[PDB]
Each structure stands twice: as structure tokens, then as C-alpha cells.
Scaffold this active site. Structure first.
Site, mmCIF file in Angstrom:
data_model
loop_
_atom_site.group_PDB
_atom_site.id
_atom_site.type_symbol
_atom_site.label_atom_id
_atom_site.label_comp_id
_atom_site.label_asym_id
_atom_site.label_seq_id
_atom_site.Cartn_x
_atom_site.Cartn_y
_atom_site.Cartn_z
ATOM 1 N N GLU A 136 -5.598 -4.969 10.879
ATOM 2 C CA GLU A 136 -4.816 -3.755 11.219
ATOM 3 C C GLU A 136 -4.994 -3.443 12.694
ATOM 4 O O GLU A 136 -6.039 -2.911 13.082
ATOM 5 C CB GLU A 136 -5.268 -2.536 10.434
ATOM 6 C CG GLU A 136 -5.092 -2.696 8.938
ATOM 7 C CD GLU A 136 -5.425 -1.378 8.248
ATOM 8 O OE1 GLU A 136 -4.603 -0.468 8.259
ATOM 9 O OE2 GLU A 136 -6.558 -1.223 7.837
ATOM 10 N N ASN A 195 0.869 -1.201 0.000
ATOM 11 C CA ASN A 195 0.000 0.000 0.000
ATOM 12 C C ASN A 195 0.894 1.235 0.000
ATOM 13 O O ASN A 195 1.482 1.574 1.057
ATOM 14 C CB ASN A 195 -0.964 -0.007 1.188
ATOM 15 C CG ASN A 195 -1.879 1.188 1.227
ATOM 16 O OD1 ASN A 195 -1.940 1.969 0.290
ATOM 17 N ND2 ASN A 195 -2.527 1.329 2.369
ATOM 18 N N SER A 253 2.541 -2.605 12.198
ATOM 19 C CA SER A 253 3.963 -2.198 12.046
ATOM 20 C C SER A 253 4.810 -3.377 12.445
ATOM 21 O O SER A 253 4.493 -4.063 13.401
ATOM 22 C CB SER A 253 4.251 -0.970 12.842
ATOM 23 O OG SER A 253 3.634 0.171 12.276
ATOM 24 N N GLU A 277 -7.114 4.056 7.836
ATOM 25 C CA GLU A 277 -7.054 5.522 7.650
ATOM 26 C C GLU A 277 -8.393 6.033 7.095
ATOM 27 O O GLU A 277 -8.814 7.144 7.480
ATOM 28 C CB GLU A 277 -5.907 5.899 6.727
ATOM 29 C CG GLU A 277 -4.549 5.680 7.345
ATOM 30 C CD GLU A 277 -3.407 5.384 6.453
ATOM 31 O OE1 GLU A 277 -3.516 5.478 5.204
ATOM 32 O OE2 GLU A 277 -2.316 4.973 7.030
ATOM 33 N N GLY A 335 2.364 2.780 13.066
ATOM 34 C CA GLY A 335 3.088 4.064 13.095
ATOM 35 C C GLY A 335 2.896 4.852 14.372
ATOM 36 O O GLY A 335 2.962 6.082 14.323
ATOM 37 N N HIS A 367 -9.594 0.448 4.646
ATOM 38 C CA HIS A 367 -8.302 0.730 5.285
ATOM 39 C C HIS A 367 -8.522 1.565 6.556
ATOM 40 O O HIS A 367 -9.397 2.445 6.579
ATOM 41 C CB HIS A 367 -7.356 1.425 4.337
ATOM 42 C CG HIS A 367 -5.949 1.455 4.869
ATOM 43 N ND1 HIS A 367 -5.496 2.438 5.726
ATOM 44 C CD2 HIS A 367 -4.916 0.596 4.685
ATOM 45 C CE1 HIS A 367 -4.259 2.156 6.036
ATOM 46 N NE2 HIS A 367 -3.860 1.058 5.428
ATOM 47 N N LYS A 405 0.002 4.250 -0.241
ATOM 48 C CA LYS A 405 -0.750 5.361 0.388
ATOM 49 C C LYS A 405 -0.610 6.576 -0.527
ATOM 50 O O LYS A 405 -0.573 6.463 -1.717
ATOM 51 C CB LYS A 405 -0.320 5.535 1.859
ATOM 52 C CG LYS A 405 -0.365 4.289 2.693
ATOM 53 C CD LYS A 405 -0.206 4.465 4.162
ATOM 54 C CE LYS A 405 -0.200 3.207 4.974
ATOM 55 N NZ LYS A 405 -0.116 3.477 6.434
#
Ligand code: NA
Ligand code: NA
Ligand code: NA
Ligand code: NA
Lengths: 249, 248
Positions: free
Chosen positions: B165, B9, B211, B97, B171, B95, B11
């Protein structure tokens, strides 16, 4: 005098074959000079390189949206710096569909405009009232508030065009009259003169984004405070060339 | 056995020069066979045609998002039928985000997955819990609810990969342990077995999107219920080729 401006918003439409047909038709068009009219066409993101590579160089390309700030961890979004990298000069921000369906607030639109300008994009910044707002007598409060959220956040108007969208009169069957359009454009320009400067009011194009019946574009274009059109579905069709031709007189 | 799956990804990153460099590095890569590992790369919409035209044909391209239904009067949105027209075979949906920053609901994501599949796209469907949900002991309640919104709308799972996720461990400076990853993947697969079918639980890849520190992908990939990775920033770098190599 302000240069007449015609923008074509393709929305969520297009195929490689349809794009080729639209671009060939625009490339064969014979329209008023660059001194009379400024033309911008706005395809979906996935067709931006294709349209930029194939469209006549005297017509310009716009993205339909960009992100509010620098790129990074924003899965699905396209940054202003990406558009600059691809030599896409324009962006449409705050379209009624994104304010309504995607819930983009006036402050969010304002932050997008300011970021886009900072990266050197030119912006079609869209404002407009709903039926409930219109019927309450709130049109001028709403349009001034949406414009103020942008004004508060920008440092330069040179590369801004404002598009007025009467949301109650866009694909609803209701059509705003020329007089109604003139009244909003006049009051908006008067707002810029009192709250930013006489120079910004005099020089900023305010284009009409409402539905218009065939053959009625020159009556709207000829209004004192209307400087052109943000066009929806007709931008996919040969009719778009007749709207560009309304810039003549 | 389920085929190992590595998605990259990108992004909201990339320039024409950067894309050329990333694609050349991928094209020169020597990685395990197509029988061992399935690789998907996901650039921004504006680079999809460029990446599809230049990338090696044994790696596949995904969009990072698409619209919930047929195209039309949806300024700024890209429809699933547009991706099919451009021969983009995959899409990432839901996703973290987009759920967090863009407020995409579970039902909205579910409707997107169903629509994308109906147009013939393959979908990486993303689920995952926040810090507050994790601290409350709600991780599986949240992940099962997100997955249920998709299951309720989807009849065929053949072209679905699920990405977990841990949002609190992406992050943030917090790194989830392989045991934390394996626990969620095991319990999610057990949920699929009860709520869709034994066959769908057995055959659906569930890839990890948390991560991971450099050098630690094989410890995660060797977990019984981890079938690969949805990679973020490493997807822009040579390190992505070392992640694909974890499939061995
Ligand atoms: Na005029
Ligand atoms: Na949120
Ligand atoms: Na298990
Ligand atoms: Na495994």
C-alpha cells in the site's frame, strides 16, 4: 422512578453453538415484567444478526463498540448506521477494556457517544477509575472528567445509560462494597444535576459494572443511586437470569 | 507461476440491501478460471455470515481484521477462532488505515498474522510507507521493517499474501506509476529471498493496493513482481469484475 437496567456484555466470546445455547436459555427464562426491568445482551459483531433474529423480542441487543463517525475508509470498523440498518438498538461505548488496551481517550469515547445518539442508537456509556486513581482520592475527579467529556459532546441524555466500572475491582480479586458503589453513583448523579439539569440527573440510569460475589446483587441493586448492572462473564451463563431477577423489590 | 490474486476490501461500507446487490452481481459474473485467478471479498464483521451464506463457492470471504490472541475479556474485538467457527477462511491484517488511524504497530500486526495462521486462517498481510517516508527515500527501509516484524513471528508463508500500500497514493489524488509499484514489489521479493528463502520469495503473491484509474489494471498486473490487487472502493461496484478480468 428509573426502570432497573441489566446489560450483559459477552466480550470476545462465542461460537454459533454457544450462542444458540445462551439464547435458548434466555428465551425460556421467566423474569420480572417489562415495566420492572429493561434487559440488553451484547454479543460480538459476527453474532449480532444471529442473536437479533433468535432472541425473545422483549430483550434487546447491543453492539460492544462502533466507529466514531460516518462509515467510509475505516478498514475493520463497524459504523452506527450499519447497526441501525441491522435493527440493533443499543451500543456499549467506552468500556474499561477499550480505554485501557485499545487506548480510547475520554474525548474519543465522547465523540462516539454523540455520533451513535445522532444515528438514533441507545448508548451504555462506561466510566471508571484505576487503583492508582482510587488510592489518590481521585475517583470523583476521574469519573466527573470522563462524564464531562461525554456531556460536552451530546445534546440529549434520554437514550443514555451510564455504567460505572471500578477498574481496580473488576476481575482483580478486589470487590467494592455497596457503600463504595452508592457513594460514586450518588456523586455522579449530583454532578449531572449541577452540570446538565435536575431532570437529566433524576431520569438517567447509572448501572454498576464492578465484580460482585454470587448472591450479593440485591444489596447493590437496592442502593438509592444504583439502577442495575453491566455484567461481564456471568452474561454467558444461566446466572445472568438471577441478576435480572434482582430487579424484583 | 504464482496464481493471480484479487482481494476486495469493502471497508466500513454496506447495508443488507447493498450487500444483496453486490453479492448478486458477483454471483452472475463470468470471470477467468480458478486456475488463473483467486478472488477474495472482505465485508464488515456484521455481514460476514450473510456474505458467506450467499456468495458463489469459488469466491472466498475475508474478515477485515481480528484480535492479536485468544478471545476473552476484549470488549468489541473478534477472535481468529470466531472466524474459523463461522467458516471465514481469510483475514486482512495491518491495513494502512489500521496502522495510521488505529495506531497498530508493526509488532502488533506481526503477532496478529502469527496468531491467525496458527488458527488455520489465510492472511492478506498489508505493508506500506507514508508520504514523509517516500520523500525521505525510506520506502524500502519502512516496507522491509514492517515485513521483518511479520517474518520474525511466522515460520510458514504458504497461507500469506503480502499487499503493498503506497499510503501517499491511496485516495490522495496522487497515482503511483506501474514502475513505482514494480520497483517496490521487486525489492520486497528480493528481501524475502535473502531473509526467509528463495522458495518463499518465488511462491508468495505480492499484490498492489495503490489507487488505480479505470482501465489501467492490466498495465500493473503484467509487471513481473505484481501478482494482483487489494481493491478498495471499486470492490463495492461492478468495476471489481473488470479488475478480476485483468488476470487474463
Ligand atoms: Na436502586
Ligand atoms: Na496515527
Ligand atoms: Na524481480
Ligand atoms: Na504480474
Amino acid at each position: 422512578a428509573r426502570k432497573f437496567f441489566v446489560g450483559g456484555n459477552w466480550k470476545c466470546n462465542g461460537t454459533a453453538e454457544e450462542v444458540k445455547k445462551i439464547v435458548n436459555t434466555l428465551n425460556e427464562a421467566q423474569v420480572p415484567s417489562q415495566d420492572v426491568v429493561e434487559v440488553v445482551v451484547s454479543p460480538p459483531y459476527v453474532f449480532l444478526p444471529l442473536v437479533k433474529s433468535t432472541l425473545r423480542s422483549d430483550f434487546f441487543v447491543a453492539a460492544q463498540n462502533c466507529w466514531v463517525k460516518k462509515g467510509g475508509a475505516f478498514t475493520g470498523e463497524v459504523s452506527a448506521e450499519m447497526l441501525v440498518n441491522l435493527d440493533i438498538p443499543w451500543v456499549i461505548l467506552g468500556h474499561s477494556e477499550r480505554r485501557a488496551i485499545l487506548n480510547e481517550s475520554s474525548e474519543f469515547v465522547g465523540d462516539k457517544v454523540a455520533y451513535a445518539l445522532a444515528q438514533g442508537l441507545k448508548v451504555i456509556a462506561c466510566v471508571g477509575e484505576t487503583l492508582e486513581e482510587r488510592e489518590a482520592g481521585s475517583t470523583m475527579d476521574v469519573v466527573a472528567a470522563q462524564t464531562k467529556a461525554i456531556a460536552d459532546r451530546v445534546t440529549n441524555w434520554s437514550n443514555v445509560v451510564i455504567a460505572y466500572e471500578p477498574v481496580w475491582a473488576i476481575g482483580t480479586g478486589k470487590v467494592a462494597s455497596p457503600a463504595q458503589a452508592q457513594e460514586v453513583h450518588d456523586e455522579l448523579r449530583k454532578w449531572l444535576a449541577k452540570n446538565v439539569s435536575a431532570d437529566v440527573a433524576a431520569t438517567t440510569r447509572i448501572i454498576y459494572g464492578g465484580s460482585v460475589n454470587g448472591g450479593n446483587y440485591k444489596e447493590l441493586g437496592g442502593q438509592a443511586d444504583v439502577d442495575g448492572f453491566l455484567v461481564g462473564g456471568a452474561s454467558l451463563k444461566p446466572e445472568f437470569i438471577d441478576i435480572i431477577k434482582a430487579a424484583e423489590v
